[PDB]
Design a protein around this ligand. Sequence first.
Ligand SMILES: CC(=O)N[C@@H]1[C@@H](O[C@@H]2O[C@H](CO)[C@H](O)[C@H](O[C@]3(C(=O)O)C[C@H](O)[C@@H](NC(C)=O)[C@H]([C@H](O)[C@H](O)CO)O3)[C@H]2O)[C@H](O[C@@H]2O[C@@H](C)[C@@H](O)[C@@H](O)[C@@H]2O)[C@@H](CO)O[C@H]1O
Ligand code: NA
Lengths: 216, 214
Amino acid sequence: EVKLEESGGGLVQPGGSMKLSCAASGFTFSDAWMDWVRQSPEKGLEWVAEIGNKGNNHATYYAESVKGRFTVSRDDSKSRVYLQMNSLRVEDTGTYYCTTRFAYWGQGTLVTVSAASTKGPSVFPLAPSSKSTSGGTAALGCLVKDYFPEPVTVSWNSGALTSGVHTFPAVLQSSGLYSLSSVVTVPSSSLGTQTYICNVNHKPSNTKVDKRVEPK
Amino acid sequence: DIKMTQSPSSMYASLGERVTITCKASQDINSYLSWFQQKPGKSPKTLIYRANRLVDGVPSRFSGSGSGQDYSLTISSLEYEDMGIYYCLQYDEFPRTFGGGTKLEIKRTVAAPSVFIFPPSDEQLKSGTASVVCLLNNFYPREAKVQWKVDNALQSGNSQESVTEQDSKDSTYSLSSTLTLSKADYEKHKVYACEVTHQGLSSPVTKSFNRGEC
Ligand SMILES: CC(=O)N[C@@H]1[C@@H](O[C@@H]2O[C@H](CO)[C@H](O)[C@H](O[C@]3(C(=O)O)C[C@H](O)[C@@H](NC(C)=O)[C@H]([C@H](O)[C@H](O)CO)O3)[C@H]2O)[C@H](O[C@@H]2O[C@@H](C)[C@@H](O)[C@@H](O)[C@@H]2O)[C@@H](CO)O[C@H]1O
Ligand code: NA
């Protein structure tokens, strides 16, 4: 199948530089024209740059807002497309996607342009209540607090536990740090038998935390 | 720059309903128009290109029509997995330009939230800050009032809410409300309560705890 995977996104100060990469497989790469598209809550989807195939001799095209600061290029022998970003602005912040002929998309890589500091999260248990529930279901979770930049991922019991999990969108606190919670509904009878561990990963700070969530 | 205008900005539709959304360009774009669906936290997926051509693998309930400036996407019979935000794109000229998006949410029967309250952890309290969490699980519709009372004193400006988008399996929402106090403030009050008002409840539900009590 067609596959695209972007990389290189991270935190950079305003005025800094950052290079994104997109690894492509599952199609004749040299015949495909490629685009970078970015997304932010304030601007929605925004086209960034296009690079042609050999049909138009790898010609490039740019949005006016990035012309002269961003450069798109490609390595047909490596099946890679690149986006070099210089003189970055706060408004360049967003999720950057690589796409082939606007028909298939990568997963996206997050670019954060900010003067704020990288900070790894503290992970606190949301312990299941000791008061029983009427019908035998309890809730527990983990609070992933005070981190920057996004993103954090959360799994439960190293991925075995997916049923009943809700991981909330991060909220930006007044401090400029993100916080979120991940919760799971489980049987009240199992709280003595079953171990519950939330696996938190904050790759921007190289943080991995496994927090056990116990009653009381 | 070609302006792409999508309508409606957001809508609700029922399972099995026929849904049509529109995308209008500021000039003739010669059918170089694509449609995308984006689910929460995931990348867009292309549904239709050149106005009416299905991307391979896309369900047949999706179809596109139009020419010149005005285009439409139709879902013949809405499925739960069709929830999300839909975008259009013109690629007749440079710059390529996107529409502003149409949010599509699924109607369903009212579901009252299951409410849970969590005191701050002893581990967190060492830090000097206290987070109290109120959880509303699997409810519909989205509208829900969550008020914090500390020793029966209404709180304002010290809580933050997060809401999930509709769950792909049952079309419900979940919501967390987190009350943030200093540890000193937390340890000088006793009763912590979150009051939930939701149309699936006959009357407001209150979950509360007494600081320190098991
Ligand atoms: C297939 C290919 O790469 N052909 C390029 C050609 O690019 C094509 O140009 C036409 C218009 O002439 C159109 O823009 C094609 O776009 C679409 C389409 O609407 O058909 C976009 C769709 O997302 C895509 N769908 C999928 C599933 O991939 C389809 C599909 O690839 C083709 O229809 C299959 O045949 O393509 C576009 O692909 C290219 O033309 C140049 O670049 C274009 C982007 C456009 O700016 C043209 O004005 C321009 O001349 C030429 C020259 O480089 O090279 C061919 O190989
Ligand atoms: Na064609």
